[PDB]
Amino acid sequence: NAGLDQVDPIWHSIRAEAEEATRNDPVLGAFLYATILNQPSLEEAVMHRIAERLGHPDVSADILRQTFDTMLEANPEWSHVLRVDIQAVYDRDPAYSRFMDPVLYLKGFHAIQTHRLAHWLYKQGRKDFAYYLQSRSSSIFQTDIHPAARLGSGLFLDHATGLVVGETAVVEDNVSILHGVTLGGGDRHPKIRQGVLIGAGAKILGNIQVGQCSKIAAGSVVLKSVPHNVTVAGVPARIIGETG
Amino acid sequence: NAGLDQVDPIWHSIRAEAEEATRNDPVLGAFLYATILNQPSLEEAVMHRIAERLGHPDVSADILRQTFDTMLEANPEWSHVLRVDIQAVYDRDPAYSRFMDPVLYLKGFHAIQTHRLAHWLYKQGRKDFAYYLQSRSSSIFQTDIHPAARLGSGLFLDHATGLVVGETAVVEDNVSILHGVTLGGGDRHPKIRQGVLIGAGAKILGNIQVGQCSKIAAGSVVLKSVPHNVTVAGVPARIIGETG
Amino acid sequence: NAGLDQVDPIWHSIRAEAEEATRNDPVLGAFLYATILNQPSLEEAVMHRIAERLGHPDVSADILRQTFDTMLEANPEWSHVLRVDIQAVYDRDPAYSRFMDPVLYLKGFHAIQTHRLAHWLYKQGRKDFAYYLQSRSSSIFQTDIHPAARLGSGLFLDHATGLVVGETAVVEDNVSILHGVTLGGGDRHPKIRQGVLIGAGAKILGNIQVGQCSKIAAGSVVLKSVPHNVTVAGVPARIIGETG
Ligand SMILES: [Cl-]
Ligand SMILES: [Cl-]
Ligand SMILES: [Cl-]
Ligand SMILES: [Cl-]
């Protein structure tokens, strides 16, 4: 509408990718037009997708979409957060070559933003709506994230199935978390510092911290804080080397 | 209606909690009135919620609700079981401060009672209905519990995602079981004695027993019977201390 | 219709099993007639079930069923593949005594065939339809299988919850894979040779191979190729014995 905001290569690429896909598979036209092409913005596309996935007789897509609208209005920074979350997927995963892929398909990405809505509702004292969302996400996306948990931006929830994040956990920016991960057990759950990779099935338990840029090997059981710039593996986890 | 049965602090608290929540977030009114406030009893509230979550074109909420009614009629003790299952959640989990939370939201609690219905159907020789329920629960609650499995009362299925319970398994009373747990492999699956805690991701395999009050650390692989009043951890599991 | 194809003991047994079940529980009549008895073939029964489970407002059962039809037409060998996949379940699992059980109920079996459809679509350059299916299956069946992955016949996906299979993975024939398994990380994911059993929660990571007839113990973390005819266990996995 005016100024630097008009530069939006991610949205423009997504719109191009949906145009080309509908051309290639016209039966998917209702899907791609309703989710992307008929949308006035990437924000609305992402809200709409997630409201559609979570929508139920119990609480309709429309109500979820209306509430998402209220959250964007109160949290204008969500425009950037969602784009860098998108960017994380694109940069960190060779499996998917389009910006549209996380928006349409990847439940990890849908669960992140669902949590962001739930967290805001929770903070506003709308705790039933926050628990409803937590419950719905746990059932549909298989991600159980307590609404009081704090998630940074550029988070990559890869595959996602089985993720459990406790009430007092904190995840900072540019973290990647695989499927089957527990951030579990006043302050009694983990603090994950920026740039961390958490591998498949890892359990990180207690009020401990995982230092910046560290890697948690698949299947690790982490019961003690991890220094920055190390790789840890094993049950129980031990430092096995350095990393950048 | 008469006598000691009229004392029902859990139901009364739930009804108060739903009244207050609808007041605080009126859009959730359809939900809270249909699930709690319009219900004549806690039994009906819990049946209704679970029938709504599992309801599908294939087999409707109403049919599931009618069958749940038949199960309560045959199994009048379910009134108590469901209340002590509720109580377990309230007592054992700091994350949720209301009795209504497991009833409305927590799939673990929904899966326990779904299993109870499936088990009864199985015993009655209604094995397709029991397998249908098992299948539905596995898909929606991510809990795969064979209908022939036997679950005690006051069970806390915390987070629940990925639970697998085999045909010959037995869980006694006051057990807590986290997400990602396998009770797996004549008698070929585990017997879990009363008061046991099973941590996230543990696999307990074979016709072995876990003694009363014992704890299974997150990520343990248990291939041999565990004595009462010990903590075990590791792959393979070893006793690491005593506990009460 | 003519010749050796008329011999179809699996379909005939299924039809008998559905007739008997509807008799025993008539409320399940809509289900059993729509899924089995009104079907002209086992192929159509399996397509119909899976299209019903995956069907959504976003993309309807009918469209999924029409696309499944196109896949069978192009891939006539699916008739055999689906029967030997059925046979695998029947032979390898004591919990279920009917051929109809995997067809109606077991999400593992539904996810295998969903992948087969997604893979074909992917190869045809219908990558959005393939990703949509992958996404839907991940959400409903809790199986995340990249469409470029290659799965052999007679595969038994037992319990299935949490399965993650990467883009370059290969699974050969007569493999069994439990819940919670990762075949994860050019060629960067595992090659599983024929006759392998992969136990609950195992993670097999990298461009490594698991030799013919080998067993992967529950909870193993496999970072190096495994010889044929051995059992491996532990974090990290070590050979613990021979097997046939
Ligand atoms: Cl935000
Ligand atoms: Cl009962
Ligand atoms: Cl095929
Ligand atoms: Cl899982």
Side-chain angles (χ1 to χ4, degrees), chain A residues 1-223 225-241 243-244, chain B residues 1-223 225-241 243-244, chain C residues 1-223 225-241 243-244:
Chain A
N1 220 342
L4 296 171
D5 281 359
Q6 299 192 303
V7 181
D8 198 352
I10 290 157
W11 180 226
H12 298 149
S13 306
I14 282 165
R15 292 192 60 83
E17 289 155 354
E19 186 73 68
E20 190 55 54
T22 303
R23 288 183 179 272
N24 186 55
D25 209 331
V27 73
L28 296 180
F31 180 56
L32 295 162
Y33 270 79
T35 59
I36 305 279
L37 292 166
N38 287 352
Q39 299 290 343
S41 75
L42 177 49
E43 289 76 357
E44 285 289 339
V46 172
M47 297 184 276
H48 172 94
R49 183 75 194 110
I50 294 173
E52 281 314 307
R53 297 202 79 178
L54 294 173
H56 198 265
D58 287 321
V59 179
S60 65
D62 211 76
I63 283 144
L64 294 186
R65 183 180 297 111
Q66 290 164 351
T67 309
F68 239 135
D69 283 340
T70 311
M71 184 271 262
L72 171 53
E73 164 170 85
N75 298 267
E77 70 265 37
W78 191 54
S79 299
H80 169 66
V81 174
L82 70 73
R83 283 169 178 74
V84 301
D85 284 353
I86 291 173
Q87 194 71 46
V89 175
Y90 184 89
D91 289 343
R92 300 176 201 164
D93 193 347
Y96 301 102
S97 295
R98 317 173 303 172
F99 291 114
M100 196 181 74
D101 300 324
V103 170
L104 295 186
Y105 301 128
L106 305 183
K107 71 202 190 178
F109 169 78
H110 299 146
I112 290 163
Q113 314 316 323
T114 300
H115 168 71
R116 298 192 196 293
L117 169 55
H119 192 67
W120 177 73
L121 293 160
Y122 192 83
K123 258 113 109 274
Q124 298 281 103
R126 300 175 78 173
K127 307 194 169 168
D128 286 285
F129 210 140
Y131 294 148
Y132 180 76
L133 280 176
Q134 175 194 8
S135 172
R136 194 75 173 118
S137 176
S138 184
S139 171
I140 299 292
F141 304 153
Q142 297 78 47
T143 46
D144 180 352
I145 303 178
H146 196 283
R150 310 203 301 288
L151 308 186
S153 68
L155 174 62
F156 179 29
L157 250 46
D158 193 15
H159 308 291
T161 314
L163 178 73
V164 170
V165 181
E167 173 180 28
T168 60
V170 178
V171 183
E172 294 184 358
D173 300 341
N174 304 129
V175 172
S176 302
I177 304 181
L178 270 92
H179 50 281
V181 166
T182 303
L183 310 183
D187 258 13
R188 67 195 182 281
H189 302 125
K191 313 313 183 256
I192 313 294
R193 302 302 171 200
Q194 111 110 251
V196 164
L197 172 64
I198 307 171
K203 336 290 186 219
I204 302 150
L205 305 173
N207 192 13
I208 54 171
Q209 86 162 355
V210 177
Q212 254 178 359
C213 301
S214 289
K215 280 63 197 98
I216 317 281
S220 301
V221 179
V222 182
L223 304 184
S225 296
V226 183
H228 67 88
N229 293 93
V230 302
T231 298
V232 308
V235 184
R238 299 284 186 242
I239 291 152
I240 62 160
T243 192
Chain B
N1 220 342
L4 296 171
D5 281 359
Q6 299 192 303
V7 181
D8 198 352
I10 290 157
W11 180 226
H12 298 149
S13 306
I14 282 165
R15 292 192 60 83
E17 289 155 354
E19 186 73 68
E20 190 55 54
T22 303
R23 288 183 179 272
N24 186 55
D25 209 331
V27 73
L28 296 180
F31 180 56
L32 295 162
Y33 270 79
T35 59
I36 305 279
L37 292 166
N38 287 352
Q39 299 290 343
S41 75
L42 177 49
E43 289 76 357
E44 285 289 339
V46 172
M47 297 184 276
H48 172 94
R49 183 75 194 110
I50 294 173
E52 281 314 307
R53 297 202 79 178
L54 294 173
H56 198 265
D58 287 321
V59 179
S60 65
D62 211 76
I63 283 144
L64 294 186
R65 183 180 297 111
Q66 290 164 351
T67 309
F68 239 135
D69 283 340
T70 311
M71 184 271 262
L72 171 53
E73 164 170 85
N75 298 267
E77 70 265 37
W78 191 54
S79 299
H80 169 66
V81 174
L82 70 73
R83 283 169 178 74
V84 301
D85 284 353
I86 291 173
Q87 194 71 46
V89 175
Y90 184 89
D91 289 343
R92 300 176 201 164
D93 193 347
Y96 301 102
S97 295
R98 317 173 303 172
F99 291 114
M100 196 181 74
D101 300 324
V103 170
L104 295 186
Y105 301 128
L106 305 183
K107 71 202 190 178
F109 169 78
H110 299 146
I112 290 163
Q113 314 316 323
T114 300
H115 168 71
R116 298 192 196 293
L117 169 55
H119 192 67
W120 177 73
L121 293 160
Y122 192 83
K123 258 113 109 274
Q124 298 281 103
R126 300 175 78 173
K127 307 194 169 168
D128 286 285
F129 210 140
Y131 294 148
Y132 180 76
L133 280 176
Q134 175 194 8
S135 172
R136 194 75 173 118
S137 176
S138 184
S139 171
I140 299 292
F141 304 153
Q142 297 78 47
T143 46
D144 180 352
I145 303 178
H146 196 283
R150 310 203 301 288
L151 308 186
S153 68
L155 174 62
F156 179 29
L157 250 46
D158 193 15
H159 308 291
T161 314
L163 178 73
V164 170
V165 181
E167 173 180 28
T168 60
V170 178
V171 183
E172 294 184 358
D173 300 341
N174 304 129
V175 172
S176 302
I177 304 181
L178 270 92
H179 50 281
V181 166
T182 303
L183 310 183
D187 258 13
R188 67 195 182 281
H189 302 125
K191 313 313 183 256
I192 313 294
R193 302 302 171 200
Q194 111 110 251
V196 164
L197 172 64
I198 307 171
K203 336 290 186 219
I204 302 150
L205 305 173
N207 192 13
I208 54 171
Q209 86 162 355
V210 177
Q212 254 178 359
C213 301
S214 289
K215 280 63 197 98
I216 317 281
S220 301
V221 179
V222 182
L223 304 184
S225 296
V226 183
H228 67 88
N229 293 93
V230 302
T231 298
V232 308
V235 184
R238 299 284 186 242
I239 291 152
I240 62 160
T243 192
Chain C
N1 220 342
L4 296 171
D5 281 359
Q6 299 192 303
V7 181
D8 198 352
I10 290 157
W11 180 226
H12 298 149
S13 306
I14 282 165
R15 292 192 60 83
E17 289 155 354
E19 186 73 68
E20 190 55 54
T22 303
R23 288 183 179 272
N24 186 55
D25 209 331
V27 73
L28 296 180
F31 180 56
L32 295 162
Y33 270 79
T35 59
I36 305 279
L37 292 166
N38 287 352
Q39 299 290 343
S41 75
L42 177 49
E43 289 76 357
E44 285 289 339
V46 172
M47 297 184 276
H48 172 94
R49 183 75 194 110
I50 294 173
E52 281 314 307
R53 297 202 79 178
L54 294 173
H56 198 265
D58 287 321
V59 179
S60 65
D62 211 76
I63 283 144
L64 294 186
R65 183 180 297 111
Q66 290 164 351
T67 309
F68 239 135
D69 283 340
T70 311
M71 184 271 262
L72 171 53
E73 164 170 85
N75 298 267
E77 70 265 37
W78 191 54
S79 299
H80 169 65
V81 174
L82 70 73
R83 283 169 178 74
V84 301
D85 284 353
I86 291 173
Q87 194 71 46
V89 175
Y90 184 89
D91 289 343
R92 300 176 201 164
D93 193 347
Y96 301 102
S97 295
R98 317 173 303 172
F99 291 114
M100 196 181 74
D101 300 324
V103 170
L104 295 186
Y105 301 128
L106 305 183
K107 71 202 190 178
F109 169 78
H110 299 146
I112 290 163
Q113 314 316 323
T114 300
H115 168 71
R116 298 192 196 293
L117 169 55
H119 192 67
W120 177 73
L121 293 160
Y122 192 83
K123 258 113 109 274
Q124 298 281 103
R126 300 175 78 173
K127 307 194 169 168
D128 286 285
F129 210 140
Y131 294 148
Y132 180 76
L133 280 176
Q134 175 194 8
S135 172
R136 194 75 173 118
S137 176
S138 184
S139 171
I140 299 292
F141 304 153
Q142 297 78 47
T143 46
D144 180 352
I145 303 178
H146 196 283
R150 310 203 301 288
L151 308 186
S153 68
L155 174 62
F156 179 29
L157 250 46
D158 193 15
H159 308 291
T161 314
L163 178 73
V164 170
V165 181
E167 173 180 28
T168 60
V170 178
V171 183
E172 294 184 358
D173 300 341
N174 304 129
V175 172
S176 302
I177 304 181
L178 270 92
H179 50 281
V181 166
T182 303
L183 310 183
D187 258 13
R188 67 195 182 281
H189 302 125
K191 313 313 183 256
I192 313 294
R193 302 302 171 200
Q194 111 110 251
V196 164
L197 172 64
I198 307 171
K203 336 290 186 219
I204 302 150
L205 305 173
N207 192 13
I208 54 171
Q209 86 162 355
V210 177
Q212 254 178 359
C213 301
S214 289
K215 280 63 197 98
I216 317 281
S220 301
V221 179
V222 182
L223 304 184
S225 296
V226 183
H228 67 88
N229 293 93
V230 302
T231 298
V232 308
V235 184
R238 299 284 186 242
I239 291 152
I240 62 160
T243 192

